[PDB]
């Protein structure tokens, strides 16, 4: 398990390198979203 990118439609964790085809594994979809940091974000309950 390694997390870099997610698909929009099928929503399958992709994880690809710089110049490794912008398409999604399974559905041939070019729409991708980024991970979200493992850097746990904090908020004020206000």
């Amino acid at each position: 398990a390694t997390l870099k990118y997610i698909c929009a439609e099928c929503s399958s964790k992709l994880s690809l390198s710089r110049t490794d085809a912008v398409r999604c594994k399974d559905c041939g979809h070019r729409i991708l979203l980024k991970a979200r940091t493992k850097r746990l974000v904090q908020f004020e309950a206000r």
Binding site: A21, R23, G28, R30, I31
Partner: protein
Amino acid sequence: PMVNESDGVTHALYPQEARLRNLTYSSGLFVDVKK
């Protein structure tokens, strides 16, 4: 409506896709030319 893009040939373009990928939601126009 379709998207004639490289890395592929052509496929059907849906509004939300076009909105995100900054493409034009346009369809092909074909006419029968006689000779």
